[PDB]
């Protein structure tokens, strides 16, 4: 092996987010996916049952609801980790009156 890289993510296990926000994690993940998909469809990518760099085919190029549950969980957790980092970095997150 040539490269010796060990990822060390920040410990966000004890960062608490409003329950109201976590209740919306699907809403956030869905929009993240829409942004992702629009960027790939604008580059000529299309849906295909196997990923393919040469023919620009991706299986995840579907509406968010049609994704496998495993893939939605990923998207929801990515979203929550990105926000937990905001809180870890010293910002308050509060639902507006």
Ligand X SMILES: OC[C@H]1O[C@@](CO)(O[C@H]2O[C@H](CO)[C@@H](O)[C@H](O)[C@H]2O)[C@@H](O)[C@@H]1O
| 11 among annotated binding-site residues | no
Contact between 37 and its own copies per CB under 8 A: yes
Nearer to ligand X, 3 or 94 (CB): 3
71 binding partner (options ligand X, its own copies, none; Cβ < 5 to 8 Å by kind): ligand X
Residue 63 binds to its own copies (criterion: CB under 8 A): yes
Q: How far apart are CA 42 and CA 65, in angstroms?
A: 21
Segment 43 to 82, residues that bind ligand X, using CB under 6 A: 60, 71, 74-75, 78
Strand, coil or helix: what is 42?
Answer: helix
Q: How many CA atoms lie within 13 A of 31 on its CB side?
A: 5
Q: How far apart are CA 69 and CA 26, in angstroms?
A: 11
CB-side neighbour CA atoms (13 Å) of 18: 10
Q: Is 92 left (phi over 0), alpha (psi -120 to 50) or beta?
A: beta
Binding site, annotated residues for Mg(2+): 53
Q: Which residues of this chain interact with its own copies, rule CB under 8 A?
A: 1-3, 5-10, 18, 20-21, 24, 27-28, 31-38, 41, 46-47, 51, 53, 61-63, 78-79, 81-83, 85-86, 89-96
């Amino acid at each position: 092996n040539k490269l010796d890289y060990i990822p060390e993510p920040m410990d966000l296990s004890l960062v608490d987010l409003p329950e109201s926000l976590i209740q919306l994690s699907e809403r956030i993940a869905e929009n993240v996916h829409e942004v992702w998909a629009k960027a790939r469809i604008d580059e000529g990518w299309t849906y295909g049952e196997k990923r393919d760099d040469i023919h620009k085919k991706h299986p995840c190029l579907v509406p968010y609801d049609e994704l496998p549950e495993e893939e939605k969980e990923a998207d929801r957790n990515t979203a929550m980790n990105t926000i937990k980092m905001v809180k870890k970095l010293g910002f308050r997150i509060e639902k507006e009156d």
